[PDB]
């Protein structure tokens, strides 16, 4: 299954864009893809944590996106 989500990089070279990706990917792969897209500098903060802005919740960098419930329309603010 495919979903469409919004990613925020306000901490690292503030920018905003949206991705379409297959559901079964893990969280860290999203971070890797984002880094590939923007070619941003510095490695990410250890642990690859992320925050779902429109739910007030936090997940570690080991979820499978289908598992902890990240469906269409949610905003992912990268810590």
């Amino acid at each position: 299954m495919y979903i469409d989500i919004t990613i925020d990089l306000k901490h690292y070279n503030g920018s905003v864009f949206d991705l379409r990706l297959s559901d079964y990917h893990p969280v860290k792969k999203v971070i890797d893809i984002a880094w590939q897209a923007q070619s941003v500098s510095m490695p990410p903060r250890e642990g690859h944590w992320i925050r779902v802005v429109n739910k007030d919740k936090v997940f570690s960098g080991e979820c499978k996106l289908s598992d902890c419930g990240i469906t269409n329309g949610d905003r992912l603010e990268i810590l």
Binding site: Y2, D4, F17, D18, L19, R20, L21, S22, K28, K29, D32, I33, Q36, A37, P43, R45, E46, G47, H48, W49, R51, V52, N54, K55, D56, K57, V58, S60, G61, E62, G69, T71, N72, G73, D74, R75, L79
Partner: protein, 564 residues
């Protein structure tokens, strides 16, 4: 669960989800089950099998439950701890409390964790503090891990953060409900409770309609009447009038009670049927069962609330009684006349207009109408499923940062081409409107036009200086083909700008006042007052409405861009 501890960080992993064919690995590559970037792993890659510990080609022994195994590499230390049990869940209510002290060293703490009761308990202490409606953390000894990183100084706590301490996880939620997950036992003194819930919140990712509840307006007739008749001498005169007074007082009380009941019923029904925008936000927050309650089969869809004012009553009052002209207006006459006016009209009730009767117009200074269109769009969106209603919107390029929040709603998604509903410039216009006009043409060219109801009902909103003044599609937007499931709204600063075929018109006078002045193609006038409004919560509302269910590439307003 398998924990991993290295310098100033702690990570977590679950092993039950894989067969033994996959060797658990710890290394630098993302492909590895656990990723570390600061440690080069120059000697080799750590791995497990069964547990058996192997550093590349080297063997270091085994691991057993409820005991720590340490190993060294690259002049740094790493731990490994394994557990297979599952934790408990509990909730506590803080209330008026101003501080919460947690410790395993002192028995006076509110939450006491005896060090002996667990194999890996460690001496520590910390406290939570509140100030100005916000929570904060303050370590005092031992160690604390926040979001997976150690901390050493007073820090404010944000809504979703998670604290880790002695294999215990603590979370906070505004309104001050404290949640804990633990593999342990601890004493406590706080009040225990549970969160409220329903069925819909439990089925949250899925949604399905429910039976509707409808009320009928109070239809009734009432009757009324008012008086018409105009020692020796002392007893003769007064007592008759006294009897008159008593009897008429009783009669008036009865009628007053009846009229009060009827008026209250009508007010209640009108308030129930048309809630304001803030109420829609609040209902959407809790996932009420009223979302998307209407449908094409119903009659009262495409009906909007504009404000509050004065409305006529729906129950007749037969004030005729006896003929008043017989004699002069007495005190009883005056009381009856005074009561006659009050219950004729209800006050502070919704004023409603309909859109299904043809094109609608708006007139007034630009800024106020611009600030107002939000109410109408939100109200229309709350009551209709995206299987039935789709929008199209036109506006000025400069105003984009104010109109952005609507792009995430579901109804704005086109049905036949993957593109958004907005329009900025000539390129997007020529991209979209041509296809829309072609699609509408087929609707026009068919015999079953009158019989069928085309499924997606397009609602056009136009607010821009006409960049569309010469396009073909204007042939249909002129408003004579309303059976094609199309509707329109327009805005301008003066009446002359609009067309002559309008069937409803509104006008805003100032910050708080307005009135209708055309309806059903006839001249009319009713004043009304605008509602209080807020515009900073829209993003959450739209995103929440996006989720309900009823290859890699980037996505933009006008197509898809494959990644690399």
């Amino acid at each position: 669960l398998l924990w991993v501890f290295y310098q100033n960080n702690v990570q977590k992993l679950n092993l039950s989800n894989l067969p033994s064919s996959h060797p658990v690995t710890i290394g630098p590559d993302v492909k590895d089950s656990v990723t570390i970037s600061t440690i080069p792993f120059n000697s080799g890659v750590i791995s497990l099998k069964r547990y058996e510990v192997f550093l590349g080609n080297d063997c270091l022994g085994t691991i057993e439950t409820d005991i720590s195994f340490t190993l060294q590499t690259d002049q740094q230390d790493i731990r490994l701890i394994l557990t297979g049990s599952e934790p408990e869940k509990s909730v506590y209510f803080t209330g008026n409390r101003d501080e919460i002290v947690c410790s395993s060293e002192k028995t006076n703490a509110d939450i006491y964790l005896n060090p002996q009761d667990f194999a890996f308990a460690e001496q520590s202490t910390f406290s939570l503090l509140r100030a100005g409606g916000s929570w904060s953390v303050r370590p005092e000894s031992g160690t604390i891990f926040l979001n997976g990183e150690k901390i050493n100084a007073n820090t404010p706590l944000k809504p979703g953060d998670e604290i880790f301490w002695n294999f215990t996880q603590m979370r906070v939620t505004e309104q001050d409900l404290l949640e804990i997950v633990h593999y342990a036992q601890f004493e406590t003194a706080l009040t225990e409770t549970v969160k409220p819930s329903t069925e819909m919140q439990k089925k949250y990712p899925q949604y399905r309609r429910t039976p509707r509840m409808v009320y009928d307006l109070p239809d009734d007739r009432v009757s009324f009447s008012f008086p018409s008749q105009e020692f020796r001498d002392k007893n003769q005169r007064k007592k008759r009038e006294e009897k008159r007074e008593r009897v008429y007082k009783l009669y008036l009380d009865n009628k007053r009670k009846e009229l009060q009941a009827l008026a209250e019923k009508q007010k209640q029904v009108l308030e129930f049927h048309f809630p304001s925008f803030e109420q829609m936000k609040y209902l959407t927050s809790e996932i009420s069962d009223r979302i998307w309650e209407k449908s094409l089969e119903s009659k009262d869809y495409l009906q909007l609330r504009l404000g509050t004012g004065t409305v006529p009553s729906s129950y007749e009052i037969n004030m005729s009684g006896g003929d008043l002209a017989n004699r002069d207006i007495d005190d009883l006459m005056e009381k009856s006349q005074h009561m006659q006016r009050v219950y004729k009209d209800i006050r502070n009730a919704p004023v409603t207009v309909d859109l299904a009767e043809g094109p609608m117009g708006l007139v007034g200074k630009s800024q106020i109408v611009k600030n107002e269109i939000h109410q109408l769009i939100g109200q229309l969106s709350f009551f209709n499923s995206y299987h039935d209603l789709r929008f199209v919107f036109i506006f000025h390029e400069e105003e984009y940062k104010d109109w952005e929040w609507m792009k995430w709603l579901p109804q704005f998604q086109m049905p036949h081409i993957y593109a958004k509903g907005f329009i900025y410039n000539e390129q997007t216009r020529d991209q979209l409107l041509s296809s829309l006009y072609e699609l509408i043409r087929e609707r026009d060219l068919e015999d079953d036009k009158e019989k069928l109801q085309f499924k997606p009902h397009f609602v056009f909103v136009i607010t821009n200086q006409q960049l569309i003044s010469e396009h073909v599609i204007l042939e249909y937007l002129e408003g004579q083909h309303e059976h094609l499931g199309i509707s329109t709204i327009v805005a301008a600063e003066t009446k002359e700008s609009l067309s002559e075929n309008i069937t409803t018109l509104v006008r805003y006078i100032n910050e708080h006042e307005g009135d209708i002045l055309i309806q059903k193609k006839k001249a009319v006038r009713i004043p009304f007052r605008l509602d209080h409004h807020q515009r900073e919560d829209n993003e959450r509302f739209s995103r929440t409405l996006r989720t309900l269910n009823h290859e890699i590439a980037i996505v933009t307003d006008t197509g898809l861009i494959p990644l690399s």
